[PDB]
DNA sequence: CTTATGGG
DNA sequence: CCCATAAG
């Protein structure tokens, strides 16, 4: 299966990613910024319960850790639960950069007629392969409790305004290679979403492999369950994807 | 939860 | 102004 030839390459066999070749992220505040401490609005146990599970998966995962940090933000006591962290005040004092991620509609202009064989492939759980620098983890604190304290992020968090940006940079810098390889496959990247073409299905499927092996190897995982694998019609970006057009 | 937005 | 809505 394309499943068996390439285990490190998706999320269902390869385990959490972690993008090892990318520098742990420092994120710049803006000049004037000082740390703003917000207080977590008291969560009900219905609540609290749901998010729990999550919680504690991240901690043994690395991905979250306990902290004490100068900087707070809240949970949504309402956010099936999981967690969703109001980062907007942390967003505001962070240092803007320059949106580099195309527009689908723009994006999708350098599909030529040419390549009509596709791949699509979603990376789960993108940010997190991303590591955060020490000193930018206590910017993204919250505040956790078992009827205290608080907890950070080690890797790119959800939420943060600069994320979907720096994530798409990163995988750029990364897919770099493979796209000097590969001078006569079409890559095109939204953040977690990606789309390859082919001038045939031999070449699609040899695309595809070459592509799998490279993401593994760099530590990023597919979704297995999502992926649709040379085919002619393929779903992309909200878009159908059928005999060049759209 | 809080808050930014804009139709009505 | 009010609010339904969307979003962190």
């Known amino acids: 299966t394309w499943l068996s030839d390439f285990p490190q390459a998706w999320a ?108 699509v492939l979603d990376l789960k759980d993108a940010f997190f392969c991303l590591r955060l620098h020490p000193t930018s983890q206590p910017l993204f604190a919250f ?19 600069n994320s979907p940006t720096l994530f798409d940079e990163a995988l750029h810098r990364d897919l770099a290679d493979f796209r000097i390889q590969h001078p006569d496959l079409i890559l095109l990247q939204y953040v977690d979403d990606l789309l390859l073409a082919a001038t045939s299905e031999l070449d699609c499927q040899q695309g595809t492999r070459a592509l799998l092996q490279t993401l593994g190897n760099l530590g990023y995982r597919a979704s297995a369950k999502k992926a649709q694998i040379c085919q002619k019609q393929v779903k992309y970006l909200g878009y159908l994807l059928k005999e060049g057009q759209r």
């Open 143 to 161: 505040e956790w409790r078992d009827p205290s304290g608080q907890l950070t992020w080690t890797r790119l968090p959800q939420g943060f305004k």
């Open 12 to 119: 269902e066999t390869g385990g959490m990613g972690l993008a090892v070749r990318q520098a742990p992220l420092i994120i710049p505040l803006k000049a004037t910024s000082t740390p703003v401490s917000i207080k977590q609005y008291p969560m009900s146990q219905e609540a609290r319960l749901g998010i729990k599970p999550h919680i504690q998966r991240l901690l043994d995962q690395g991905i979250l850790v306990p902290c004490q940090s100068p900087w707070n933000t809240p949970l949504l006591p309402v956010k099936d639960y999981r967690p969703v962290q109001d980062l907007r005040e942390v967003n505001k004092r962070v240092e803007d950069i320059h949106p580099t991620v195309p527009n689908p509609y723009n994006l999708l202009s350098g599909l030529p007629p040419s390549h009509q064989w596709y791949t």
